[PDB]
RNA sequence: AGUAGAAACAAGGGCCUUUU
């Protein structure tokens, strides 16, 4: 983990591990499962 | 889940909807305009006279439903208490526009013509500015021998020119183009004939008493009949003036393609011809004397400072030539504020007996003689004003070839299509245009002739605009448009032409050039009527 | 450095104050935005004179002290007055003999849409001014050939991430997938002396296609149009061959072809055919010049008004022009409404076949290649329709299927013997309207087409009226022609709307838009064709 | 952009656009809702991350 | 001879000449002008009703269903009927669709909400209520909004609507606060000041900032219904309402029958302004507001009671002076009443009657309507009436379309006989005389088909462009050198293509703005022979410049431009020619004088108590920019404030310096111990 | 004196506010 100025007036905090799942798939996924 | 929200928050700070408005809490999901008790207490008041409250009027309004008998019936009710007036001119006629009467409309113009005499000297190049021309003019010895006379032809406040004359030669002679603030100079330029403010605090009705006091009693201008004069400046201003090039010009660029070519041709011809001409000569003289005027008073202001009226040409085919037009001063040009005044004077010469309707303005000084044989001397001293917005646009006046060019290009490309051919040479040579009437018939010239009138046209457009032309050519406009319609046997018709007519001669008031273009329009709607309909006599 | 000290001196010295200190603690940092405006506030009317008026000043010029020192440039060369201790005089002694920049090849890069413009300008050939009454139509175009074309956030994160990096927003969508573009852009402006805003202007015209709504003749492309004033006028036209610069209509048709593909492709799956659509279109990518794009970006930034393209732009959500079609034909309402109403028709004898039929008046513009038209309808009626092309078949087509779109004449009351019910409809098991069957039919061959145009009344031509008079091989006059049908000379210009519609799409790739009406349909597109697309990437199985 | 529903889709799927919309009009609140109840419902999906 | 110039008309087409009559080629060109103007407003109100106000205690007549005095109706009548207003909307309603409002109130309200109270800057000049005085908005709102804070607390909000809330909460408090050499008002001189609407010469309004939101979220609603109409012109401009008039006159030519002949009306609309009532505009926006959020519905209905309560200031007042002229009194409106004695006949019949109603320096006045305030929603209201159709029309086989924009239409009639050519024009001025629109007889006429005019454009079986119009904008407007001369080309490029300008006239129009330029900065061509300090050193020094071609103009340069290249800048072609060490020296970033226009060295930049907070604002957006390089660009923004960026971008800077660059530890120690210092000593003291 | 319009200027503050 480490804190990082982004822009501008931000500061935030990161962490080194890639966490880009799909999101129009699981969002598709449960609005298909809601209908049911 | 922090990623998203990251987004989401950049893109709602982004577009400024980060506020509870859109990102409320459970409680905070009532926003409302926060109603007041006066904003009530007015709206309340100013609900139509039926109703009483502003609820019984959006009640009656979110239900109104439409019962078309009734708004017809009130339609034709109203319809029936109007009866609104159609009329067909070809029934009821245009009656001639009356002029108003009185003396002869004087000349208004700063800078005299035709009468204008001037004088040449070969051009310096090192000595290019003002007051090293208006020097070396007056080096020679011709400009040091005028000594006017204590009586003028006409006119009023002799003394006071012939002194600022006087004054002005001791200046030049100096080599310091500075005038003292003396008795003539003082009342020429009103240096202190400026009302001073007296405070309403400070009053009461004895000092009403000890000196008058009422509502200023504001006086309209006066009624000035047709000029008989203006005919023959237009005359004159179509001929050519023995020298070629008055008005500056850039220098033509290169070229590619055949557009480029003909254009450049087109440009050629027409500059070509409007540079020998007399108008184009008061066109360099505005730009120089204006601009030499201009760049001082931004610089020596509270200084009565000399400037020369001059110009610059070109003999014809050779060498160059700085002419003399007069000499003008400028008052205290202290422009504090935009649309400002500032007092000038003008001295400009002449060979030829002075009108008294027409240069009414002036007070001439016959002045000793003139070579050419020898010729007497005529000294028009005037005292005109001018402001910033006229500097500027006289200095811009060179905008009159745009138009003039478009003008007729308009012709010679709409004549050249309806061909599919290039006809724009055989239109300038041969196309006929009326350009008045001599023995009772109708004159007509080639375009290549009809230039100038249009350049003249342009030029006294850009110097006598006032409020009254701008509402004249305002209100013509109708009447040509109903020419049209008369020439296609189009029925028009109108509602109220009487009050047309009343309006356009309420802007006719003491300036030649309405006056003159009323009576042309006349004259014209005349010569129509023996071709055409809608028109009395 | 000691500047750094500086500023933090500067910095402690206003948080000394009481005011600013208050407004800074306060709030957030937006308002400096708003501060901006507070502050440096005048205008002046005319600003010609007041130029003139400041020239002609003692010394109108200002320069910092430091630049004229580092400089080293002499006081006053020959007795004049380059500064008290600025003419504009200076700043030519600078231009003749002065300190010299390292290079200045940078500003070709700076300005590239302009050397762009220059450099295409170079290469026409000019051919002959000729004259005569130009057609001129006024519709929207385009007038700056772009690649890449982006939207206002996508530039704004471009020009942050090029130039100013320490300040850079978190990472986008966009930059993550467009990194060549970025790393082109940045490798460029990278440790250079430049005024750093300028070239942030320069990047945002690099990518704004300049859309204007402007009189037009002729082909419609960029390239012309960035100069059309000097290639034609209302009386004038000045020939030149424009067609092999900044080529940008291969792209657009090669896109149009591959959503043709995918749209054909996805029609097989009856239950999910909007899915398999979709993931289609998010597998697939091309190359553009250099770079290569994925699809969807592509579509989004397009503006082809096309049933494959709004199909797609449904799918996807984007949103779309208020444009309707049917066929290889375009429409416009200009005003009107109604609703739906049912009608049977005999497709031989007895076999009832329903079709809905819109019911009030409704004007529409109408564009087929070449030809344009402003025609009306009227409860299943065809009112009235005015046509300003200029060929005869383009003009006898748009007639017949404006006549199709309303379903007028009596073939609708009782359709041709030689329709059948095999084609009428489920030809993939989808029932096939009436009206895209006449439509097949009148494509099928050109003696339907003429028995069509039979079917609307024909009337003799009455004086006068011959030259605004259409026959039936669309004569420009005869001596009997088609029942109110207007011909004019001149095309109808093309209107104009600022909206912006939602629009879904249904199982059947049916597109409504808040309406009964049917946008776009895959039956409304060319049977198929096999094309060898060169540089995409169909990563499908 | 000038609907709501566009502003939130340019962020959000717009499947749960339509979804909030829905939700919405049901309970018969503002549209100006489409947003947060948007975010809500995708933060759950997204949550769930099958 | 006397030479007459309109002869070119006896055998010419009209419309080819017309532009030579506009004098467009020369220099264009209180209280007696607002005391008429009001008086013919209380007049045209035909009805006497008088209500008594309780706020303000001053007699209100009613300019809303009150008709009374049905004399010679030809002329302006001031007084409407809801009930056809209404009607007329209803029409108008049906023929767009179902729910036709309702979308146009919604694409407002998503932008009213989310809008910036930092627009408002970006408008005229509007009237300040702490000075008296007009003012740039950015003054007056930084002014307004300084006085908020001294009265009550800091405004947090950052939104329209919050301003609007504000606005009304300050309506009821007592006492208001702002700065002055910082005098305090009680409710009512406040509740006055904040109505004045004050006038500018030019003439035109010049309302309050504490209306002007409101007129804007109105002015919008209007703006998104007008957009949709296909019969209006006011929003759009040029092209655009030529095609409009195309396609409305092949639709007409096309509809009419062969027994049916059209007509054509060019209208001008008199006393637009007067006769206007804000009443009718509340009841509109009130059926239009009958579906949408109840918010809408207030907000809208705000500004047209304001409108129907403004007061009006008198300006200047009357001048006295002597016989003579030498003395000379000057007197404010206020103290008019007590001079009542010492003033022209005219003038005091003209002041007697409103005595009543005047107020110290305003006269209220509860309707009316003044010019720039509501154009689109008159425009709309002005397009309802030609949507009517009714029984009696379609009987006798007439129809009349049009186009209106603000106080100047053009009518399309259709009928079978001139007996019902001239009934149905009747029935159209009945119909807009029961909504306060009138007609003037005068400057209004028509003809048969293919001969009108809409807004100074004549139209015939061609449009001539007028031409006048844009002649002014043929001038350098004055910023530098390098803008100079582009916007030039690029004004002429534009009239090229939508005026029709010829190649000739742009070429003469080029010629005349490169001489005037030349000019204006004293430049004149090496060749020439303008001697001048600046032409000495440079004809010299051209002898070191190898390359005459690639010379700059303002240095000395010749014209290489012409038709095929307006659309690109002198610099770009020369760049090739251009000496290595002139372009080097040219272009050289740093120097010490250093939009579509190239940046070079020719580009140069050549009441108190307010300077003060303007120079506190400088400093801080200043140092701001100077820390960060992209503030002017992509607007910042965050949860941060100033302070708190600074604080720590400064010390990544720091530490990134001390790494690697060249800092040394003591320098970075003290710079971070000043940084604490400043950040202490910001929070402890406020 | 003069300008122009449907009112304003005819300097204002305490000594200051040359190249078509």
């Known amino acids: 983990k480490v804190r990082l100025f982004v822009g501008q007036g931000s500061v935030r905090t990161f962490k080194r591990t890639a966490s880009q799942r799909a999101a129009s798939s699981d969002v598709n996924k449960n609005v298909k499962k809601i209908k049911m | 889940i922090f990623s998203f929200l990251a987004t989401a928050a950049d893109f709602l700070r982004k577009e400024n909807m980060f506020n509870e408005i859109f990102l409320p809490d459970n409680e905070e999901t009532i926003i409302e305009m926060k109603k007041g008790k006066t904003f009530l207490e007015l709206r309340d008041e100013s609900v139509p006279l039926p109703f009483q409250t502003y609820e019984q009027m959006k009640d009656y309004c979110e239900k109104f439903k439409g019962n078309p008998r009734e708004l017809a019936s009130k339609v034709s009710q109203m319809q029936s208490n109007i009866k609104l007036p159609i009329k067909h001119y070809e029934q009821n006629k245009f009656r001639q526009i009356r002029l108003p009467k009185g003396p002869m409309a004087p000349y208004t113009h700063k800078f005299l013509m035709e009468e204008a005499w001037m004088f040449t000297k070969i051009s310096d190049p090192e000595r290019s500015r003002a007051g090293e021309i208006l020097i070396d003019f007056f080096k020679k010895g011709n400009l040091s021998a005028i000594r006017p006379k204590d009586k003028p032809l006409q006119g009023k406040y002799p003394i006071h020119y012939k002194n600022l004359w006087n004054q002005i030669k001791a200046a030049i002679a100096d080599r310091t183009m500075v005038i003292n603030e003396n008795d003539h100079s003082e009342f020429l330029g009103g240096i202190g004939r400026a009302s001073k403010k007296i405070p309403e605090i400070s009053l009461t009705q004895d000092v009403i008493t000890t000196e008058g006091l009422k509502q200023s009693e504001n006086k309209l201008p006066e009624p000035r009949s047709f000029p008989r004069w203006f005919n023959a400046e237009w005359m004159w201003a179509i001929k050519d003036s023995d020298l070629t090039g008055w008005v500056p010009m850039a220098e033509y660029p290169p070229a590619d393609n055949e557009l480029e070519d003909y254009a450049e041709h087109l440009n050629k011809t027409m500059e070509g011809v409007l540079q020998g001409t007399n108008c184009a000569r008061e066109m360099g003289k505005c730009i120089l004397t204006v601009g030499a005027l201009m760049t001082e008073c931004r610089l020596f202001p509270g200084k009565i400072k000399v400037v020369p009226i001059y110009a610059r040409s070109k003999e014809r085919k050779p060498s160059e030539m700085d002419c003399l037009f007069g000499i003008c001063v400028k008052s205290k040009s202290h422009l504090n504020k935009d649309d400002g005044m500032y007092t000038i004077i003008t001295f400009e010469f002449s060979i030829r007996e002075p009108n008294l309707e027409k240069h009414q303005k002036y007070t001439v000084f016959e002045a000793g003689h003139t070579t050419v044989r020898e010729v007497p001397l005529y000294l028009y001293c005037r005292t005109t004003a001018l402001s910033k917005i006229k500097n500027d646009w006289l200095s811009k006046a060179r905008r009159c070839f745009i138009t003039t060019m478009d003008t007729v290009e308009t ?55 006032d409020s009254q032309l701008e509402g004249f050519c305002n209100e013509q406009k109708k009447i040509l448009m109903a020419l049209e319609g008369d020439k296609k046997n189009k029925s028009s018709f109108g509602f109220n032409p009487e009050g047309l007519l009343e309006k356009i001669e309420e802007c006719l008031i003491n300036n030649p050039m309405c006056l003159f273009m009323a009576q042309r329009l006349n004259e014209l709607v005349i010569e129509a009527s023996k071709r055409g309909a809608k028109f009395f006599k | 450095m000691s500047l750094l000290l500086t500023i933090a001196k500067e910095y402690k010295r206003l948080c000394q104050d009481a005011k600013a200190a208050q407004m800074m603690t306060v709030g957030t940092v937006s308002n400096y935005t708003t501060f901006k405006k507070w502050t440096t506030s005048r205008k002046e009317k005319n600003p010609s004179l007041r130029m003139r008026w400041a020239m002609s000043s003692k010394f109108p010029i200002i320069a910092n002290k430091r630049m004229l020192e580092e400089a080293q440039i002499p006081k006053e060369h020959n007795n004049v007055a380059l500064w008290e201790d600025a003419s504009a005089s200076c700043i030519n002694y600078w231009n003749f003999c002065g300190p010299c920049v390292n290079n200045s090849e940078v500003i070709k890069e700076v300005y590239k849409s302009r050397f762009g413009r220059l450099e295409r300008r170079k290469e026409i050939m000019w051919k002959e001014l000729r004259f005569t009454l130009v057609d001129r139509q006024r519709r929207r175009v385009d007038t700056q050939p772009v690649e890449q074309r982006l939207r206002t956030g996508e530039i704004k994160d471009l020009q942050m991430w090029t130039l100013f990096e320490d300040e850079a927003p978190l990472a986008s969508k966009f930059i993550l997938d467009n990194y060549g573009l970025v790393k082109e852009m940045r490798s460029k402006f990278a440790n250079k002396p430049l005024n750093k805003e300028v070239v942030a202007h320069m990047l945002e015209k690099q990518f704004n296609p300049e859309s204007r709504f402007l009189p037009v003749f002729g082909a419609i492309r960029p390239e012309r149009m960035e100069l059309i004033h000097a290639l034609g006028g209302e009386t004038w036209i000045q020939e030149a061959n424009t067609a092999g610069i900044s080529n940008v209509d291969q792209r657009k048709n090669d ?123 009227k409860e299943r009626s065809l009112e009235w329709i005015t046509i300003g092309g200029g060929i005869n078949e383009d003009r006898k ?91 004019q000379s001149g095309k109808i210009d093309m209107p104009e709307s600022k909206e912006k519609i939602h629009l879904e799409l249904s199982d059947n790739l049916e597109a409504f838009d808040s309406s009964g009406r049917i946008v776009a349909t895959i039956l409304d597109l060319p049977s198929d064709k096999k094309v060898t697309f060169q540089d995409v990437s169909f990563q499908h199985p | 952009s000038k609907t709501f529903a566009e502003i939130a889709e340019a962020f959000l799927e717009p499947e749960a656009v339509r979804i909030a919309k829905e939700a919405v009009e049901e309970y018969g609140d503002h549209e100006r809702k489409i947003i947060q109840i948007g975010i809500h419902f995708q933060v759950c999906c997204m949550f769930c991350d099958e | ?153 800091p405004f947090k909000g950052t939104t329209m609507l919050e301003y609007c809330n504000k606005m009304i909460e300050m309506l009821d408090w007592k006492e208001i606060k702002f700065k002055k050499v910082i005098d305090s008002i009680k409710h009512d001189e406040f509740l006055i000041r904040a109505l004045t609407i004050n006038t500018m010469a030019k003439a035109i309004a010049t309302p309050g900032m504490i209306v002007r939101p409101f007129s804007k979220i109105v002015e919008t609603v209007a703006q998104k219904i007008c957009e949709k109409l296909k019969e209006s012109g006011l929003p759009v401009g040029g092209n655009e309402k030529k095609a409009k008039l195309k396609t409305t006159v092949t639709s007409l030519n096309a509809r009419m029958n062969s027994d049916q002949f059209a007509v054509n009306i060019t209208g001008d609309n008199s006393k637009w302004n007067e006769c206007q009532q804000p009443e009718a505009y509340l009841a509109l926006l009130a059926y239009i507001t009958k579906d949408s959020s109840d918010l809408m519905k207030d907000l809208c209905s705000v500004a047209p009671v304001l409108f129907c309560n403004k007061f009006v200031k008198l300006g200047q007042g009357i001048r006295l002076s002597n016989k003579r002229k030498t003395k000379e009194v000057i007197i404010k409106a206020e103290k008019m009443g007590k001079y009542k004695n010492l003033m022209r006949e005219e003038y005091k019949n003209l002041f007697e009657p409103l005595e009543k109603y005047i107020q110290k320096d305003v006269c209220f006045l509860p309707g009316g309507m003044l010019m720039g305030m509501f154009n689109m929603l008159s425009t709309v209201l002005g397009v309802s009436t030609l949507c009517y159709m009714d029984e009696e029309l379609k009987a006798k086989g007439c129809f009349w379309t049009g186009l209106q924009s603000s106080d100047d239409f053009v009518l399309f009639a ?169 372009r080097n020296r040219v272009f050289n970033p740093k120097n010490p004088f250093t939009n579509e226009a190239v940046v070079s060295t020719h580009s140069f930049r050549t009441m108190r108590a307010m300077m003060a907070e303007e120079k506190r604002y400088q400093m801080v957006c200043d140092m701001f920019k100077s820390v960060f390089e992209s503030a002017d660009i992509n607007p910042p923004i965050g949860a941060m404030s100033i302070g708190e960026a600074i604080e720590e971008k400064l010390l990544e800077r720091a530490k990134m310096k001390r790494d690697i660059g060249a800092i040394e530890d003591s320098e970075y120690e003290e710079i971070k111990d000043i940084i604490r210092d400043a950040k202490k000593a910001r929070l402890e003291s406020r």
């Not at chain 3, 309707?324 to 375009?330: D, E, K, Q, R, V």
């Not at chain 5, 264009?28 to 209500?51: A, F, G, H, N």
């Not at chain 5, 070191?544 to 012409?562: C, P, R, S, V």
């Open chain 3, 397 to 487: 087509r748009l007639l017949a299927m404006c006549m199709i779109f309303c379903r007028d004449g009596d073939y609708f009351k009782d359709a041709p013997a030689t329709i059948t019910m095999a084609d009428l409809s489920t030809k993939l098991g989808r029932e096939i309207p009436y009206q895209y069957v006449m439509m097949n039919w009148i494509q099928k061959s050109e003696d339907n087409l003429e028995a069509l145009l039979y079917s609307r009344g024909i009337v003799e031509t009455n004086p006068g009226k011959m030259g605004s008079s259409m026959g039936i091989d669309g004569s420009k006059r005869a001596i009997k022609s088609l029942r109110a049908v207007t011909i």
């Open chain 5, 1 to 153: 001879m006397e030479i007459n110039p309109y002869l070119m008309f006896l055998n010419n087409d009209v419309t080819s000449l017309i532009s030579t009559t506009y004098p467009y080629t020369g220099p264009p060109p209180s209280t007696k002008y607002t005391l008429e103007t009001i008086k013919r407003t209380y007049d045209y109100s035909r009805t006497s009703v008088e209500k008594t106000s309780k706020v303000f205690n001053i007699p209100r007549r009613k300019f809303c269903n009150c008709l009374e005095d049905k004399d010679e109706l030809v002329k302006p009548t001031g007084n409407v009927d809801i009930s056809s207003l209404l009607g007329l909307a209803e029409m108008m309603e049906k023929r767009m669709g179902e729910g036709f409002f309702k979308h146009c109130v919604m694409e407002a309200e998503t932008e009213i909400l989310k809008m910036h109270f930092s627009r408002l800057t970006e408008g005229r000049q509007t009237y300040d209520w702490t000075s008296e005085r007009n003012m740039p908005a950015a003054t007056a709102l930084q002014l307004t909004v300084d006085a908020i804070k001294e009265t009550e607390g």
């Open chain 2, 411 to 465: 012709i010679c490309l709409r004549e050249s299509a309806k061909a599919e051919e290039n006809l724009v040479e055989k239109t300038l040579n041969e196309k006929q245009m009326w350009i008045g009437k001599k023995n009772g018939e109708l004159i007509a010239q080639p375009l290549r002739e009809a230039l100038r009138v249009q350049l003249v046209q342009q030029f006294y457009f850009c110097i006598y605009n």
């Open chain 5, 414 to 582: 259709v009928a079978s006989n001139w007996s019902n050519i001239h009934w149905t024009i009747r029935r159209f001025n009945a119909v807009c005389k029961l909504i306060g629109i009138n007609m003037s007889l005068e400057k209004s006429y028509g003809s048969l088909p293919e001969l009108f005019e809409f807004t100074s454009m004549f139209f015939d079986g061609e449009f001539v462009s007028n031409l006048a119009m844009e002649l002014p904008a043929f001038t350098t407007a004055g910023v530098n050198e390098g803008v100079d001369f582009t916007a030039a080309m690029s004004i002429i490029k534009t009239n090229m293509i939508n005026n029709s300008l010829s190649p000739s006239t742009a070429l003469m129009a080029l010629r005349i703005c490169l001489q005037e330029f030349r000019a204006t900065y004293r430049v004149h061509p090496w060749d020439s022979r303008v001697k001048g300090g600046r032409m000495k050193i440079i004809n010299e020094f051209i002898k070191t410049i190898e390359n005459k071609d690639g010379l700059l103009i303002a240095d000395g340069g010749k014209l290489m431009n012409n038709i095929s290249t307006l659309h690109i800048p002198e610099e770009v072609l020369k760049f090739e020619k251009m000496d290595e060490q002139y």
């Open chain 3, 255 to 377: 896109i149009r072809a591959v959503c043709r593909k995918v749209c054909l492709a996805a029609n097989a799956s009856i239950m999910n055919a909007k899915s398999k659509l979709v993931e289609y279109i998010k597998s697939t990518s091309m190359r553009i010049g250099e770079t290569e794009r994925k699809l969807e970006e592509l579509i989004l930034e397009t503006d082809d008004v096309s049933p494959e393209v709004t199909l797609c732009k449904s799918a996807l959500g984007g949103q779309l022009g208020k444009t309707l079609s049917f066929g290889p034909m375009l429409l416009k309402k200009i005003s009107g409404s109604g609703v739906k109403v049912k009608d049977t028709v005999y497709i031989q004898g007895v076999r009832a076949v329903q079709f809905e039929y819109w019911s009030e008046q409704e004007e529409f513009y109408g564009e087929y290649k070449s030809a344009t038209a402003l025609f009306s309808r």
